[PDB]
Amino acid sequence: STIEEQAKTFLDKFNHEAEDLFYQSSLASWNYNTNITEENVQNMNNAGDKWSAFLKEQSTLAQMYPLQEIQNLTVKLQLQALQQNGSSVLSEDKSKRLNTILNTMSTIYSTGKVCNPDNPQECLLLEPGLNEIMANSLDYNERLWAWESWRSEVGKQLRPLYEEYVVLKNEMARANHYEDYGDYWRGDYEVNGVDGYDYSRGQLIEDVEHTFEEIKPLYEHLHAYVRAKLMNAYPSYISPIGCLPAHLLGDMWGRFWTNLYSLTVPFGQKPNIDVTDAMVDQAWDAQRIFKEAEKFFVSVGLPNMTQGFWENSMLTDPGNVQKAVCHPTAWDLGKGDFRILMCTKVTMDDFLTAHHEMGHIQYDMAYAAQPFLLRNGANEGFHEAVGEIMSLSAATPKHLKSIGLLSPDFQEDNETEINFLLKQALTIVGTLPFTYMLEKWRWMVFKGEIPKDQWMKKWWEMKREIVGVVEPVPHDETYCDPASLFHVSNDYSFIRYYTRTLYQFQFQEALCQAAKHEGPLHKCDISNSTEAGQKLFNMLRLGKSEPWTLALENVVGAKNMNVRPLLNYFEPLFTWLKDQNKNSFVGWSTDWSPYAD
Amino acid sequence: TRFASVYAWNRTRISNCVADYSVLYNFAPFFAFKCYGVSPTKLNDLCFTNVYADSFVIKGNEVSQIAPGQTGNIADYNYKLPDDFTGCVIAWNSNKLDSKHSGNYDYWYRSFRKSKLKPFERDISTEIYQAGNKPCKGKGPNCYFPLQSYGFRPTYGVGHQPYRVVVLSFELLHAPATVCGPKKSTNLVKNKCVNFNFNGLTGTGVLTKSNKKFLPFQQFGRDIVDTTDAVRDPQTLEILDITPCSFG
């Protein structure tokens, strides 16, 4: 016998118990999220502990199968996935301290609250009230007060915890032969051992910077337009050449500019495209939404759903008699068990989220044929991109008119198209510079290019330089405003969203070219096109057994991220912005600040 | 009620009876069945010396492996049919009966063995499968158990549901066969020139009642010229005479 046969037998023995315990943990988590009871919480905790013990006992045993003597690529990938040490390489005390700091930061973020100075007994939470002020208020004083109080109450307690967290993550990365924790995150994009498809971590940074520089003109035009509109929306509060305040971006952190559509609408006299009223008139429900989504996914050429999918998925609100998490989540249990947890209502946003979750479930069923260790997408953003392309295809006016929602007398005009493109840009293009800036700041903090006494200073400098956002109050080093975000405090990366934003447009262009679409890109409908769906499924069925570059080239013909799809999509909006900004200044100045007076 | 495991399938001998396949739909009519080298329509009147029936339970995806020339975890180490097998393979779903909550581990299947099994071979050995070059001893690294449990759950997909499979075998030898197929039998008309067939005796003539007295072991009589002139009803045991139809 050889080492390869021993590794194959070990994987055959492993996969059975692995899938069994994974199905058990998934069922426990489903029972928890569908019925919040003490028994369900205890079962979920027990399943998590059992899964952790299983991952621990399977580790340190696969090390007896060296990768240098393995010829099969699948066996080598499975062994590499089983020979991961994680944070267990450090001492027990350091790991316990890291876990305690993570739990404390998560608790502080979840328990974030802002109390009224005039009444200490009245307090508002982050999501229920603060974000709502930022979405639906125009009082500058109240927004400034909230933006100051939230950070003064949250960030001032997370600075040393975040410092020690970064220190421990850097120590763990150096223990795993990595330069820093950002390098450990970028290592997921690294590809080796494939001729013509290798990828390095520095190449990722180079491509991200190149895409940022390519989006920079369009983002500058969009920012100039938004500033010119806020000059009338907020008189004497927006500088003609200065940066925009942080509390006037539509939310608490400035992630998405979707809330600014009501203040930056080009043509307010045109009606908004919304099929919610048509769905209510036709007496639709969650069942009808999911059935139409299934019909679309069959017309595009994807497999049907199973009976257990419709029998187990909680597609309706269980009410107060059974507390459940109405957050739309996709669940993969294995052994042919696929469930969706979503309290779907009669709206267009839920109609698109249903197609998103259905694309997720289709990707799950596609990579289910691969071994359990390979039952995952080629990248973290692949599932979200496959969901978003289907959501955009369903959001097209052609698809909504073909299914009987839009009236047959519906007429299209250039103003509605421009408004839709501007909304899609504020929802999609607006978050890309902020995401890039935040990810670069986190990478520089992990690597150590920014001294500890200048963290917030460099944060605000990068903000003003990249996102064109100036802070109203110069917060010193005692604040930890960047850690006041979910993805930052719960140890999640942000480059995944940028990669998904690129991949969704790339996949959309590829499917529209495969479907022989003619005309604008936003008018492309992949309905009744089995070729594009089959081509997408041919890549979705591979899972993580192949590098992301090969999976990307099998769909769009490119081995790297491409910015041309976004430009081809926003070309009409780009021309409109270039024509409208002839009377205003393009760009932003980092010297102006609200506290300069 | 309880079927045997796939690695320990039992063989049931069937002889000295008529093989009626219509009663199978009584116990579940979802009997998806495929035949090889024979057809169920032509099997309704064939004769065989001995009939053997095997039974075992497998998953949904493993049903396609029970066929001549297949290869898989079941076809190589649990149960295999010869390349020239003559018979039919019957299978049906059993998720509503053989599956229990928290997994049903009562069924086991062989997954690791040093050699593949021959057709119609049974092996229940539980020796530890030695994967490494070093001699195996005890249990640990490079040590694997040859049997694995299914763990049937009612919420599993159709491909993982338990399926009860029954294979019928037929054998013919130089011995008087005792298993044959179902027959027919019609009515009985009299005073008419019609064709008749009494338990293999063919002819033509008019059938009327006679006054002969046959002994309990007699079946048919003959006259001086050794021609058939009287027979008995196999279902009435009465005496009937045979007369040739008119001619001239």
Curated annotation (Swiss-Prot), chain A:
Effect of residue 23 to A: Strongly inhibits interaction with SARS-CoV spike glycoprotein
Main enzyme class: hydrolase
GO molecular function terms attached to this record: carboxypeptidase activity; endopeptidase activity; identical protein binding; metallocarboxypeptidase activity; metallopeptidase activity; peptidyl-dipeptidase activity; transporter activator activity; virus receptor activity
Membrane topology: Single-pass type I membrane protein
Hydrolase as UniProt keyword: yes
Outcome, altering residue 307 to P: Increases slightly the interaction with RBD domain of SARS-CoV-2 spike protein
Consequence of substituting residue 368 to L: Increases slightly the interaction with RBD domain of SARS-CoV-2 spike protein. In sACE2.v2.2; increases interaction with RBD domain of SARS-CoV-2 spike protein
Free-text note on domains in this protein's UniProt record: The extracellular region of the ACE2 enzyme is composed of two domains. The first is a zinc metallopeptidase domain (residues 19-611). The second domain is located at the C-terminus (residues 612-740) and is 48% identical to human collectrin. The cytoplasmic tail contains several linear motifs such as LIR, PDZ-binding, PTB and endocytic sorting signal motifs that would allow interaction with proteins that mediate endocytic trafficking and autophagy.
Protein name: Angiotensin-converting enzyme 2
Organism field: Homo sapiens (Human)
Swiss-Prot record, chain B:
Annotated region (Disordered), positions in chain: 111-145, 174-196
Protein origin, superkingdom: Viruses
Result of changing residue 109 to F: In strain: B.1.1.298
Chain residue ranges for the region called Receptor-binding domain (RBD): 1-196
Residue ranges, annotated region (Immunodominant HLA epitope recognized by the CD8+): 104-112
Mutagenesis or variant effect for residue 145 to L: Increased resistance to neutralizing antibodies and human covalescent sera neutralization
Result of altering residue 148 to N: Reduced host ACE2-binding affinity in vitro
Outcome when changing residue 151 to S: In strain: Omicron/BA.1
Region Receptor-binding motif: start-end pairs: 93-163
Disulfide pairings: 35-88, 47-180, 136-143, 193-245
Residues annotated as domain BetaCoV S1-CTD: 1-182
Outcome of substituting residue 2 to K: In strain: Mu/B.1.621
Segments for region (Integrin-binding motif): 59-61
Effect of residue 2 to T: In strain: Omicron/BQ.1.1, Omicron/XBB.1.5, Omicron/EG.5.1
Role of this protein: Attaches the virion to the cell membrane by interacting with host receptor, initiating the infection. The major receptor is host ACE2. When S2/S2' has been cleaved, binding to the receptor triggers direct fusion at the cell membrane. When S2/S2' has not been cleaved, binding to the receptor results in internalization of the virus by endocytosis using host TFRC and GRM2 and leading to fusion of the virion membrane with the host endosomal membrane. Alternatively, may use NRP1/NRP2 and integrin as entry receptors.
Assembly: Binds to host ACE2. RBD also interacts with the N-linked glycan on 'Asn-90' of ACE2. Cleavage of S generates a polybasic C-terminal sequence on S1 that binds to host Neuropilin-1 (NRP1) and Neuropilin-2 (NRP2) receptors. Interacts with host integrin alpha-5/beta-1 (ITGA5:ITGB1) and with ACE2 in complex with integrin alpha-5/beta-1 (ITGA5:ITGB1). May interact via cytoplasmic c-terminus with M protein. May interact (via N-terminus) with host bilirubin and biliverdin, thereby preventing antibody binding to the SARS-CoV-2 spike NTD via an allosteric mechanism.
Name of the molecule in the record: Spike protein S1
Organism: Severe acute respiratory syndrome coronavirus 2 (2019-nCoV)
